[PDB]
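Changelog-linked ticket: 1-indol-1-ylethanone example.
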Amino acid sequence: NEDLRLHLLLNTSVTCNDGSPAGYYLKESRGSRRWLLFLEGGWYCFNRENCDSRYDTMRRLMSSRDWPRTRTGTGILSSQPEENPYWWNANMVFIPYCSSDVWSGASSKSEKNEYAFMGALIIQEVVRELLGRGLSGAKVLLLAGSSAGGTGVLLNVDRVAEQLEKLGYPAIQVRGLADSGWFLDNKQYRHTDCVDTITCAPTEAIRRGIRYWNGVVPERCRRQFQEGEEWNCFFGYKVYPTLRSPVFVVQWLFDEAQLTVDNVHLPVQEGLRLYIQNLGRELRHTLKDVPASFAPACLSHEIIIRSHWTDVQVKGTSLPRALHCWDRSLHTPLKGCPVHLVDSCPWPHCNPSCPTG
Ligand SMILES: *[C@@H]1O[C@H](CO)[C@@H](O)[C@H](O)[C@H]1NC(C)=O
Ligand SMILES: CC(=O)N1CCc2ccccc21
């Protein structure tokens, strides 16, 4: 089944990196008042040289010119209850990541800019165009996303809420689901000064990206960190306390992209063993006061649009169940239907339900 259909944005000034129109894939579900808007991930680029390389060999992440007319909804975007016990009957939207800016940008291609970085405006424009296609009747809009798209949820969920309130739709409850987008600005296992793309740690790359992209962050977080320090708001544990919309956080404790930016590449000796155990402990610590969260002790990356997303469990509860319990909690804790699920065991795949690879 190729069930989500492409719509290029009617406002063609809201563009992917190369100026081609951005867009979204939609599968409507008549009579459902639930809307799931999913933000794709896929790293980022932060200067002309590394964006030019991404344009050669990752062009679908910078351009709509070669996008297919349809995509199959998978995982949480599946319309089959067998694959998606949580929201199989929802209106489904997949928003391709073509702005390379962790969904933060608000800059057009121009005389001075080789590329457009419009991630934050793409989300706003998708929402605006969907209102005319049934979103005006929604009761819940779940803004979800994986990897850079998960960070994109944290950066944009409150702006979607503000946008709907000020367009006159205060009854739409905006919520976020951030998958694999909760990163730590920690010490690398082996250290590299930022002199090129590979050596350059995410705090510095994001610092440069914000200026290159004209990147924007949520207002309360911006007001805390102030000018020049907005990069802090790309780190979940710093931006989450500032957010007003309910946000469910999904994060593997030993996320593969976290390990990549930490220069860890997997007989593990003591220094690396301690490094990995400390990373899991720090991640667990950052989630202690996140009431809706699912954080399994696995070495993996992304979950919610994988077809076998139903398989992993923490304390005997799967993610689709936890998300269902979250919906119920947003109607005191619920008997047998938990929403805070963080593994405490200290090594990858100490949870037997971890993805096998
Ligand atoms: C098109 O999008 C741009 C960027 O958000 C915005 O400035 C402009 O008002 C939009 N135009 C229309 C007609 O929607
Ligand atoms: C893979 C990815 O997307 N990463 C890794 C580090 C980071 C920091 C903020 C936002 C995104 C990302």
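Closing comment: Example verified and attached. Residues 1-357 form one domain. Residues 41, 43, 102, 147-148, 151, 183, 202, 206, 234, 257, 261 surround 1-indol-1-ylethanone (ligand 2) (CB under 6 Å).
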